[PDB]
């Protein structure tokens, strides 16, 4: 196959010792992506040819979760095709791989010196530390960011990968990968993103994609939509309802300490539980989960049974860690393998629903608060 890299992949020359640091990073990236392919393709549940994914946590007509065999989606099928191509000719794919040591698009971080010390590669890349970032920010956002990043290894180690993976894709099994990828405090500076603790207690990283370490633009003239990485959300946080054009996949790694520690919601934009009104080339979606109505929309997440979920375009979704033992545990959270399938078409912006009661209530947003989501049509 023919690989065309993204335009910001620049030729590089490493010393012999530096090349070994890159190579270990690359090798663990390939394990991660091979395990990702196997997680998509290995049959589970009542699916014969691929993994069974939750696509609605509450189907309005059945009052029950709704699933689909994940490789029935053509965009997922193409991710798998492109992963197979990468794994079949990794020397060619490696031309598009870079440790992002001098990446200019935006800042990338390592959680802490403790996490940095997990690999010679991470020490060499020498990303700025999130413990320094959040000490400077201070306040309640900084307090949450310190709590997450000071305890990052413990939070991301409380995982069980034995049932749906054949190798430990967590930070324990792939420490060079998890310590060297670029971590992004995606919500820390977003005043619309809800509570201060959620904003400081959220991180993601991208192994493969238009902003990852592996940045392939096209394979055999096909645009690579795959965008694959990981997320970490501190316990006792709730996110605002989210939506966006790209389809999205989460695989839950955290082993919960109570069945309701980590709850998620995904419901299609046109679900009859919401109120929709046509807007100019879009939809206004009003969400009223008040007075306990939200509870039936949210499902428990775990690495065995409810481990896989796939979000169709503009599906409303949220991750919620306030219930149950979130009020007794410590140094815990929700850690996942994360992906989007169409990162090179339509609007990649992560959209946030907003409180119906105005900006005054952003800092307490939670599933029970009435919200408005301004969805845009995507291109066919």
In whole angstroms, the minimum distance from the beta carbon of 228 to Zn ion comes to 14
Instruction: Say if residue 317 carries a ligand binding annotation.
Output: yes
In whole angstroms, the minimum distance from the beta carbon of 218 to Zn ion comes to 25
In whole angstroms, the minimum distance from the beta carbon of 351 to Zn ion comes to 9
By beta-carbon proximity to Zn ion, the closer residue of 171 and 315 is 315
Torsion of Cα atoms, 225 then 37 then 169 then 145, to 10°: 20
Compute the distance between CA of residue 187 and CA of residue 198 in angstroms, rounded to an integer: 8
Decide: residue 233, CB within 10 A, 0-12 exposed, 13-18 middle, 19+ buried: buried
By beta-carbon proximity to Zn ion, the closer residue of 175 and 201 is 201
By beta-carbon proximity to Zn ion, the closer residue of 313 and 366 is 313
Instruction: Say if residue 189 carries a ligand binding annotation.
Output: no
Instruction: Say if residue 268 carries a ligand binding annotation.
Output: no
Return phi, psi of residue 211, to 5°.
Answer: -130, 20
By beta-carbon proximity to Zn ion, the closer residue of 160 and 248 is 248
Instruction: Say which residue the tokens 């997440």 belong to.
Output: 301
In whole angstroms, the minimum distance from the beta carbon of 204 to Zn ion comes to 10
The two three-digit tokens of residue 4, written as one number: 């065309």
Residue 20 is given by DSSP the state H
Site string for Zn ion, 199-238 (x = CB under 5 A): ----------------------------------------
Find the angle CA(331)-CA(335)-CA(339) to the nearest 5 degrees. 160
Compute the distance between CA of residue 187 and CA of residue 352 in angstroms, rounded to an integer: 11
Contact between 269 and 378 (Cβ < 8 Å): no
In whole angstroms, the minimum distance from the beta carbon of 266 to Zn ion comes to 9
Count of chain residues binding Zn ion (CB under 5 A): 2
Compute the distance between CA of residue 366 and CA of residue 326 in angstroms, rounded to an integer: 15
Contact between 35 and 159 (Cβ < 8 Å): no
Decide: residue 36, CB within 10 A, 0-12 exposed, 13-18 middle, 19+ buried: buried
**Site for Zn ion, residues 233 to 272, rule: CB under 5 A:** 242, 248
Partners of 254 in beta bridges: 159
In whole angstroms, the minimum distance from the beta carbon of 209 to Zn ion comes to 14
In whole angstroms, the minimum distance from the beta carbon of 270 to Zn ion comes to 17
Compute the distance between CA of residue 71 and CA of residue 212 in angstroms, rounded to an integer: 24
Instruction: Say which residue the tokens 């169709």 belong to.
Output: 312
Binding site per annotation, positions for Zn(2+): 244, 248, 317
Residues of this chain that interact with Zn ion (CB under 5 A) are 242, 248
Q: Can you say which residues are annotated as belonging to the binding site?
A: 244, 248, 317
């Amino acid at each position: 196959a023919q690989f065309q890299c993204q335009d910001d992949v620049k030729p590089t020359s490493y010393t012999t010792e530096e090349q070994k640091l890159v190579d270990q990073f690359w090798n663990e990236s390939l394990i991660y992506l091979d395990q990702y392919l196997k997680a998509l393709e290995t049959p589970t549940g009542q699916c014969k040819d691929s993994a069974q994914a939750t696509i609605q946590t509450y189907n309005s007509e059945t009052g029950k979760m709704q699933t689909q065999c994940i490789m029935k989606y053509r965009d997922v099928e193409l991710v798998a095709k492109h992963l197979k191509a990468v794994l079949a000719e990794p020397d060619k794919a490696k031309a598009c791989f870079d440790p992002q040591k001098n990446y200019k698009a935006f800042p990338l971080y390592t959680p802490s010196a403790h996490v940095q010390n997990l690999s010679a590669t991470s020490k060499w890349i020498n990303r700025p530390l999130l413990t320094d970032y959040y000490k400077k920010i201070g306040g309640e956002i900084g307090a949450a960011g310190l709590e997450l990043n000071e305890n990052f290894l413990e939070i991301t180690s409380r995982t069980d990968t034995t049932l749906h993976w054949t190798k430990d894709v967590s930070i324990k099994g792939l420490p060079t990968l998890w310590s060297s990828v670029g971590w992004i405090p995606f919500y820390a500076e977003n005043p619309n993103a809800g509570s201060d603790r959620f904003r400081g207690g959220y991180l993601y990283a991208e192994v493969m994609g238009p902003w990852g370490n592996l940045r392939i633009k096209e394979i055999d003239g096909e645009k690579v939509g795959a965008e694959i990485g990981m997320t970490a959300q501190l316990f006792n946080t709730s996110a605002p309802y989210h939506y966006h054009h790209p389809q999205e996949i989460y695989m839950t790694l955290t082993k919960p300490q109570c069945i309701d520690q980590n709850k998620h919601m995904v419901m299609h934009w046109d679900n009859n539980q919401f109120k929709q009104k046509r807007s100019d080339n879009g939809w206004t979606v009003n969400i009223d989960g008040s007075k306990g109505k939200w509870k039936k929309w949210f499902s428990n997440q775990d690495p065995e049974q409810n481990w896989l979920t796939y979000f169709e375009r503009n599906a409303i979704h949220a991750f919620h860690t306030l219930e149950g033992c979130n009020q007794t545990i410590k140094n815990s959270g929700l850690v996942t393998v994360w992906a989007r399938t169409t990162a090179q078409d339509n609007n990649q912006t992560t959209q946030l629903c907003r409180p119906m009661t105005g900006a005054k209530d952003i800092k307490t947003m939670k599933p029970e608060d009435k919200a408005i989501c301004d969805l845009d049509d995507w291109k066919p």
